[PDB]
Every structure is written in C-alpha cells, then in structure tokens.
A paper describes a structure:
The 14-3-3σ protein, which has multiple interacting partners with specific peptidic motifs, was used as a case study. We have observed this phenomenon first-hand with human 14-3-3σ, a protein which has several hundred known interacting partners in the cell. Furthermore, different isoforms of the 14-3-3 protein are function-specific. For example, the 14-3-3σ isoform (but not other isoforms) specifically targets p53 and is associated with tumour suppression, making it invaluable to determine crystal structures of the target peptide with the correct isoform.
To address this problem, we present a combined co-crystallization and peptide-soaking approach to obtain crystals for any 14-3-3σ–peptide complex that may exhibit difficulties when crystallizing under our optimized ‘sigma’ conditions. The second step involves, after these 14-3-3σ–cJun-pS227 crystals are fully grown, displacement of the c-Jun peptide via addition of the desired peptide for the final structure at high concentration to the crystal drop and incubation for a period of time until full occupancy of the peptide is achieved. To demonstrate the experimental reliability of the method, we considered this approach for peptides found in the PDB where co-crystal structures were published with isoforms of 14-3-3 other than the sigma isoform, since they were not able to crystallize under the standard ‘sigma’ conditions or any of the other hundreds of screening conditions tested. Not only does this significantly reduce the production time, but new 14-3-3–peptide structures that were previously not accessible with the 14-3-3σ isoform, despite screening hundreds of other different conditions, were now also able to be resolved. All models were determined to belong to the orthorhombic space group C2221 using Zanuda. In addition, the method retains the robust, stable, high-resolution and well diffracting features of crystals originally grown in the sigma screen.
Numbering used by the authors:
A (entry chain A), C (entry chain A): -4 to 231
B (entry chain P), D (entry chain P): 387 to 396
Write the structure that this text describes.
C-alpha cells in the first residue's frame, strides 16, 4: 500500500485537508491507508471514509449515466453509426467505477465489518456494503446481476434488523440507511410499493420520536426526514 | 430532479 | 504513450465524450494522445486541448490555494504546531500541478508551436505557453521564479505582437490573450498600472471595431469585453 | 469574487 509508510494520524489529518481542498480521490486514498493500519475507525473517521468514496464514486456514476445515455441514443433506429468509441469509453468509466466499489467492499470485508461490534459502527458499515453493491448493480447487465442485487439486499436487511433493535427511530444512521434501502427497492429491486412503504413508515416513526431530542439532534434528524418526504413526493 | 440518497456529493 | 494504439479520430471523439461527462482528466489524456500523433490541430481540436487542461489545472490551483492558505495560518504567531502534514500535502498538490504544466509546455515545445504558421494557431499556442508558465509562477518561490515569470512574459509578448499585426481587435483569441496578459501584469509581475492600461486599451479598441461584425461575432467579442470590464471594475 | 482569465473552468 502506497500509504504504508505514513502515520495513521497523518493520514487522517491529510484526509481532512483533502476534503477542504475538494481533492476527494486523495481523500479516499488517505482513508484507505488509514483503514489498512488495521485499527477500528472512530465515528468521525468512518464518516471521512464514507464522504471520500461517495464523492469519488459520485463523479464516476454521473459520468457513466451521461455516457450510457449517449450509447442508448446511438442504438436507436435512424441513429448514425459512429463506431465503437462510445461503448469503449462507457466501458472504461464502468470498469473504473467497479474498481472503486470493489475497493470499498474489500475494505469492509478486510476487516472493518468483522471487528464492528457496536450498533453504530456495524450498521454504518453494512449500509456502506449495501450502497456499494447497489452501485455495482446500477451498471450490472450479466449473469451475476441477480447475485449483486441480492448482496445489496442482504447487507441492507442485516443493517435494518440491527438498527431497528438497537437504535432510536430518529438516529441519523438508521434514517439514512432506510432512505437508501428505500431507493434500492424503488429503482434496483423493481419494488416501488416497498420503497414507498419503507419511506413512509420510517418518516412516521421518526416524527413520533422527535420529542425526545435536543435542538441539535432535532435538526440532524429532521434534515434526513425531509429527504424521505422529498422522495415520497417524487414517487406519489 | 433526482431522488435522494445519503451521503450526497459535495 | 498510453494512447499510441488509438486512432487520432477516436481520441478526438472520446475527448468530446469526456467533456460531456465532465471527465476532464480523461479529456486531457485523450487530447495529449491526439497531439502526440504529430499532425497539426484544427481550431476545434485546439480548443478541446485548452478546455481539457484548463479544467485539470483549475482543480489543482483551487486546491493549492486552499492548502497554501491553511499553511500560512499555521505559520502565524499563536498558531498551534501541527507537524509537517500541511506543508507535505501542499507540496504534493504543487508537484502534481507543476507536472501538468510541464506536460502542456512539453506538448507546445514538441512540436505544436514550431509547426503553427497561421496567426490563429500561433497566437493560441503562445497564449497557452504564457498561461502555463504563469501557473508555474503562481507557486514558484525559488531561484528560478524570475526566469519562470520572464518565460510567461516572453510568450505573451510574442503572442501580443502577432495578434496586433495579424488579427482584428475584436478577435476572441486576441481578446482572451489580452485579458490573461493583463492579469499576468496585475498579480504576477507586480504591474497593476500596466494591467489596467492593457485592459482598457484592449476594451476600447474592440469597442470601435464591433460595427464590422455579424451578430454571432458580436456576441462572442462582447462576452470577453465584459470580462475585461469586470476586471477593470475590480481593480479601480 | 475572482478576476477573470480565459478559458474558465466548467
Ligand atoms: Mg507511504
Ligand atoms: Mg399501490
Ligand atoms: Mg493506446
Ligand atoms: Mg496610477
């Protein structure tokens, strides 16, 4: 690992500098280096890991969608043949995206998840596992697409089971997990009714628990509740 | 206007 | 070169796809590959080259400025010592930036400039040479800073001399060259009066030539004239 | 609000 000679604390420090500089590829490399030191991650370090890779894969996913759309127009009737270049470049971006997803899933499997015993860390990492299998599913077209989708589902489901048992309904990790699993149902699993049911139950149960919260916790939870409501408004 | 997942990009 | 096996036309096609996908590092690699085919670039291909590398170096420059600012706060009195990490990471970003500038300057020197005989191509490439020496000057602190600055100045000056002789005062390349050379005077050469004089003379001479232009040429030239005016408003 | 040079970033 290219980060093997750098101190864990220095990697975390530079991850935070990279975030401020909007150097998210650097941020992700620094956080990968920190994970590979072998120690568990704190709450703030987990969020650095998530923010870094989400920004990296977000650029790739946006690019893949643009290129996929161009590729599909070219396969319409009446479209002029322009050669293999669009497919080739879409495939190049797709392969790079899949490599980033494989890297994150590898970090979770070696060995973040197996050492995560607290609800907050285990649910966080299982949500991440569901998310990055979901991004693999967005580009999957072959024989293992069903298995990729079921890997995402299985990770989300175990995270949901733990979060329901161990976290209050307003917990921001529980809420973001439910938001993402709901989107999984809507656009990956072809299950829009499940997506809507999950978003609405999650919103309603969080609403009924807001009265227990401080002002700052209330702001954190209601922000995510609004994202759930926005999705419901889009879907109904 | 895309549906929301978390975290969001910068 | 990693692009040596790809057709020139396919590289240009994929540069345009990369632009649409906002994959500017890819765009720049594709256009570098196209330049290394050895043929001269058309007007549209020159602009693809410029847009690609400007976006790449623009991310690096923005990052360097953030990191430089953090580094400077840390060297204030009363600032807590936090180790070498800020300087190290600023240096890392700076080295990568310098490598991109060196790559562009290498393309211009081997062999874009020496084959550029028309005013539009020669002025374009000399402006690029001034620009990328200018970005080297923005981060230069050592014994060759004066030589870097004079390389930028010399490139801009030859581009100015050609553009004055061979192009109308409303030509968009002439106008953008003057805009950038004016900024060179203001913030690299410590010559704000020269910067203001150049921007105002450039604006006034373009204004007096607008009557010769089509509607579409008028829109192109007046857009850049507004950037000159905005700079003058900032500086006076 | 930064002074202008060309081209500008996306
Ligand atoms: Mg190392
Ligand atoms: Mg129904
Ligand atoms: Mg090749
Ligand atoms: Mg004066």
């Amino acid at each position: 690992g290219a980060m093997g000679s750098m101190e864990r604390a220095s990697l975390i420090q530079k991850a935070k500098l990279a975030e401020q500089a909007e150097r998210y590829e650097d941020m992700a490399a620094f956080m990968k280096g920190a994970v590979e030191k072998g120690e568990e991650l704190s709450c703030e370090e987990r969020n650095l890991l998530s923010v870094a890779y989400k920004n990296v894969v977000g650029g790739q996913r946006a690019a893949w969608r643009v290129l996929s759309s161009i590729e599909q127009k070219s396969n319409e009737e009446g479209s002029e043949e322009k050669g293999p270049e669009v497919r080739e470049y879409r495939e190049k971006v797709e392969t790079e995206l899949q490599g980033v997803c494989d890297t994150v899933l590898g970090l979770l499997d070696s060995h973040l998840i197996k050492e995560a015993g607290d609800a907050e860390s285990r649910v966080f990492y299982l949500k991440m596992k569901g998310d990055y299998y979901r991004y693999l599913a967005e580009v999957a077209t072959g024989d293992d697409k069903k298995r990729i989708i079921d890997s995402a589902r299985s990770a989300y489901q175990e995270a949901m089971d733990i979060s329901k048992k161990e976290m209050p309904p307003t917990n921001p990790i529980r809420l973001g997990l439910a938001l993402n699993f709901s989107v999984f149902h809507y656009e990956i699993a072809n299950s829009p009714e499940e997506a809507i049911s999950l978003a609405k139950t999650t919103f309603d149960e969080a609403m009924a628990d807001l009265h227990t919260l401080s002002e700052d916790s209330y702001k954190d939870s209601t922000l995510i509740m609004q994202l759930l409501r926005d999705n419901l408004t889009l879907w109904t | 206007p895309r549906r929301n997942t978390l975290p969001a990009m910068d």
